[PDB]
Each structure stands twice: as C-alpha cells, then as structure tokens.
C-alpha cells in the first residue's frame, strides 16, 4: 500500500494540531499541549486510491527528535499553515518555506499553504494577499477551520495530489 | 516554541 509522508508546519497558536486531528480522529480539540510533537497515520480513500497518510504534526523545539529528522529527511509534501486572525502567522510563513527548500535543497517541494480559522469573522489576512503569497511560491492556498472542519479534507488531499504529480 | 504559547500566538 502507498504511504504519503507529511510534515504540518506553521507558528504557534495556528492550529497544527487542531487541523491533524479533525483530519485523523474527526474532532474538534479544545486545547492540546503545546509542548507535544506527534505522528498521526490513519487510512484513507483520496480519489478512489486507498492509502496511509503519516503525519508530523511538527512542535518546533529544541530538544533533539530523531523522529522529527526521519520525518524532515523522508518527507514528500508539506502544509504551511498560519490562522487568518493572526497577522504575524502570515508573515512567519516564509521563514518555514525557507527551511524547508534547505532540508530538500530545492525550490520545488511539493507543499500546500493553508489559512486555518476561517470560522472566525476577525480576518486580517485576507484572501488575496493569502492568494499573492501562494501564487509567488507556485503552490495551491487552501482555506480551513478545523473547528467545524471546513477544507480540512481537501488541504491534506490536495498535499498527497501535488505529492504524486511531483513523483512522476 | 508551540511548547509554551500553545493555543494563544506570539
Ligand atoms: N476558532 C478556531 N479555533 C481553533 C481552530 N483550530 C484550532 N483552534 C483552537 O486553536 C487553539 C490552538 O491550536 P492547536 O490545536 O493547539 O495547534 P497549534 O497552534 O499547532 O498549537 C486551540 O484552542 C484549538 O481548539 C479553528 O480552526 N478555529
Ligand atoms: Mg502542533
């Protein structure tokens, strides 16, 4: 069976681990440890394929991890996640693509930036400049709320889509 | 450093 091996990046308080989640167990978690770097597999059907997904839902310490390097060295796509509500989220996205064309030594990493939050009416980063920023790295942006799971499917999906057109 | 702000931001 085929594996898809993904890396959720993005600042705190965005919702990393809201999104895998909602996405693996199907509910909305009110708070979860800041402190905790987990993995997350699940089976799914995406476009009629059955498959693994294996996620890191990534929590950005110091302390050394070598799962989190097994996880930075094999992985196949990204998501880049910043909350709409949260200004600086969106200004710390770069930061996290930079990082990740190093561990790839490329410019062309299958990756998928998501605005998490769209629940909530205090936007501050709008579509557009979410769409300009997504459109100058050559990626799909993709809008979520992982409270009432709006995108939360698609965000991971269209992950795994641009992982198998990157593979071939 | 999610470790610490957690739900909130910084
Ligand atoms: N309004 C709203 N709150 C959310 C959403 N997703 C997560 N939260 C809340 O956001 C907080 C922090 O996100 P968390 O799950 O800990 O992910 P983290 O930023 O990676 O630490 C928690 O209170 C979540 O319940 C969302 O889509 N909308
Ligand atoms: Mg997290």
């Known amino acids: ?12 308080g965005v919702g990393k681990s809201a999104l895998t989640i909602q996405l693996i167990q199907n509910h909305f ?22 498959c693994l997904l294996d996620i890191l839902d990534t929590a950005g310490q110091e302390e050394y991890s070598a799962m989190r390097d ?23 996205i770069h ?8 561990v790839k030594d490329s410019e062309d990493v299958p990756m998928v930036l998501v605005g998490n939050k769209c629940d909530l009416p205090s936007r501050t980063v709008d579509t557009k400049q979410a769409q300009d920023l997504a459109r100058s ?11 009432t799971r709006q995108g939360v499917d698609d965000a991971f999906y269209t992950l ?9 | 450093l999610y470790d610490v702000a957690g739900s909130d931001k910084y």
């Open chain 1, 1 to 12: 069976m085929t594996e898809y091996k993904l890396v959720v990046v993005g600042a705190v």
């Open chain 1, 29 to 50: 978690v009110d708070e979860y440890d800041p402190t905790i770097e987990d993995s997350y597999r699940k089976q799914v059907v995406i476009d009629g394929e059955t």
């Open chain 1, 70 to 92: 097994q996880y930075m060295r094999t992985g196949e796509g990204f998501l880049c996640v910043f909350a709409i509500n949260n200004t600086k989220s969106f200004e710390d």
């Open chain 1, 95 to 102: 930061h996290y693509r930079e990082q990740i064309k190093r």
């Open chain 1, 137 to 147: 790295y050559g990626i799909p942006f993709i809008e979520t709320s992982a409270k």
């Open chain 1, 160 to 168: 795994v889509r641009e992982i198998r057109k990157h593979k071939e």
